[PDB]
With several copies, the nearest count.
Chain A
């Protein structure tokens, strides 16, 4: 790698002498191969060429600085020379050691030719710390930046000075006050953020200030709860065991810890044999918390609750296993056959009304004969006109199979009915 770096600086006042210079390490030339240039930029203006030199034998200087300039070299020592004699009021510029290729493209650091004495005092620091709001693709850019110095070059080093992959040490400023401010970004993977420690670590030897600082990103998660029935055969059977259950889902993997509170009645049961379990679901968990119920308490009009408290939830999601108020009702279970215009179709379908019911504690089904059937859709009921509930059940079969004389039985397992089940039955 090539470097070009200048010396001789200070601030001085017109009618006496200053000698500037530039040394190079990592590419050959000085004068021998190509040429060299020196530029100047006044504070508020841009770039103007001040001289040229060749292989060794032709130095031509600018009509401002003509007859005046001397742009010389020291080939064997690889160093450059700018000894001049009368830099007046306006000549105070940003002089930089400009190697040539085919025109003037390798940039030095340069050293300032300025006019009457001067000071040297302090920097400090700034870390561009990244916005969660996403830019496109696998791009993420965070940073560092350094503020308010006097003398320039600095040593802005990333993660003590290592990780110069996706780094753009963004360029400096020389303020209207006379001060300084630059940046230094880290343009690496978005996933590799949070997963790793990144540190901005500066140093300034013109005064004495050194520094160090980090990173983090963000995205989706915040859970859901639900509460569930005991089976009605578990509750009606004196010998089989009922239970109320509290599923908490969407938990997370960065906030597991799901605590429960259990109120059988208003008075805390606390315990009974409430049993949770946290198991590795898709990229979160499924937690199944489990109360034990003695039949009667359900049947003697009891109120239940599960106040789920996880840290990912600022405020604990309560849920009452609450039944509803009432009308009687026992479903108006009448299955129905097709519109005749489906015997002009390879595939028929079958209905099963279950209207007129209160609670919405429904469990319809279908069959072919002793074994079940696979193709069905069941409506999860609408609160009716005369203050009841109703639904419709499907069985998507074949006309060919229908006229073979198949015995489809819409098994229903809803409530103020006889065997906590009633089955209406259908065929042609």
Chain B
């Protein structure tokens, strides 16, 4: 019900001490000394770094000093590294079984730039080429807006039919991704030497191919 109230962001330089917090509800942070700090990396589920007010297990280092004063529980990641860019959050018990978990703090090492990965091109399969079909496609993976476009070529010129291009949304790294496909039969693929695909994405516009020609 209760959300454990965390500072929304906190920043430190490399070689500085970063502190984070967590304000409870009786039955959790204040009740017991069982306050639990975690570290999540955008791709998977959270790891364990601190529980029980400065009680840590194995693998995790000397640097992590987390505890509680008042009902503001604290975590201090001193002498920080480029490794520590992650989603850190507080937790605590309630009694019997239940527990309340935090609203998150984003830790930053100071200053930030841009990044890009892949848009390929693929044919059909021989599972469909068998009982008449050639369904090709065009993949526009990963970006951060939810606004990309697509269009194709077939021997270099504008095509107009049978292509279903549809709109992008979020992944497990919380970046959006896109879909497209065009449908012909064996014969129309067999007549055609090329199928080039052109995506765009906010001025970063593309006429793509990894392909070093098409031949044999």
Contact = CB atoms under 8 A, between A and B. Distances in A.
A and B touch in the complex (CB under 8 A): yes
Interface of A: 35, 43, 49, 52-55, 58, 60, 62-63, 66, 101-107, 122, 124-129, 131, 145, 147-148, 171-181, 183, 209-213
The 9 closest A-B pairs by CB, nearest first: A177-B166, A54-B97, A171-B172, A176-B167, A148-B179, A177-B167, A176-B169, A173-B177, A124-B137
B168 A176 contact: yes
Interface of B: 1, 36, 38, 43, 45-46, 48, 51, 91, 94, 96-99, 101, 118, 120, 122, 124-128, 135-137, 139, 141, 146, 164, 166-173, 176-181, 210
A54 B98 CA distance: 8
Contacts of A173: 168-171, 176-177
A107 B44 CA distance: 9
Nearest to B140: A181
Contact of A60 (B97, B166, B171, B181): B97
Contacts of B51: 102
Contacts of A43: 169
Tell me the dominant secondary structure on chain A's binding face: loop
Contacts, number: 126
Nearest to A177: B166
A125 B125 contact: yes
A181 B98 contact: no
A175 B168 CA distance: 5
A60 to B, nearest CB: 5
A209 B45 contact: no
B125 A181 contact: no
A122 B91 CA distance: 42
Contacts of A60: 94, 97-98
Contacts of A209: 125, 127-128, 135
Contacts of B48: 101-103
B127 A210 contact: yes
A126 B140 CA distance: 10
Contacts of B43: 171
B128 A181 contact: no
Given A103-B36, A103-B91, A174-B170, A127 B178 contact: no
Given A62-B1, A171-B173, A175-B179, A147 B167 contact: no
Name, among B91, B136, B168, B169, the residue most crowded by chain A CB atoms within 10 Å (CB to CB). B169
Nearest to A148: B179
Contact of B178 (A106, A125, A175): A175
